[PDB]
Amino acid sequence: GPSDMFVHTRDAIYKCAHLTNPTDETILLALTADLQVDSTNVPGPDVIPCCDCTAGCYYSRSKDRYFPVECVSHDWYEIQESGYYPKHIQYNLLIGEGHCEPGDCGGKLLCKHGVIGMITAGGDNHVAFTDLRPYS
């Protein structure tokens, strides 16, 4: 569960858009958030809180462990060119100090109340999460 690179709530599945494709169960697609949301008939264990938290813990796939992390909100952020996207702007980010490598996208960010984010980009001791709360 903690290692899953997606968020699975009672009614929906949240994935990083570049890691999937639109399907007939897609209910939200936002490339400005690198986010795809699909409806699902099978209930999931995760909960997206309506809290205000910016601090918690996240899964790092490259290190294969969880890290504590403290984040700051950014309305928008410049993501550098990768392999799936050109250099572009993304919206609603949480940014914290922490390790991040290519391949870590989708790793969950949790506060006490539930999952609030997913790794979407990161670099030199910075990790960027899309805040899922605006989109739930």
To Zn ion, the closest distance from the beta carbon of 96 in angstroms equals: 15
**Phi and psi, residue 134, nearest 5°:** -55, -30
Among all residues, which ones are annotated catalytic? 18, 34, 105
Amino acid, res. 37? V
To Zn ion, the closest distance from the beta carbon of 49 in angstroms equals: 5
Binding of residue 53 to Zn ion (CB under 5 A): yes
Of residues 71 through 130, those in contact with Zn ion by CB under 5 A are 111, 113
Binding of residue 55 to Zn ion (CB under 5 A): no
Task: Label the pairing between strands 12-16 and 7-8.
Answer: antiparallel
* DSSP code, position 135: G
* DSSP code, position 80: P
Binding of residue 27 to Zn ion (CB under 5 A): no
To Zn ion, the closest distance from the beta carbon of 73 in angstroms equals: 14
CB atoms within 10 A of CB 41: 6
Nearer to Zn ion, 27 or 51 (CB): 51
Instruction: List the one residue from 31, 51, 55, 72 that touches Zn ion (CB under 5 A).
Output: 51
How many residues sit in the footprint of Zn ion (CB under 5 A)? 5
SS3 109: strand
CB 58 within 8 A of CB 98: yes
Which residues in this chain contact Zn ion in the complex, by CB under 5 A? 49, 51, 53, 111, 113
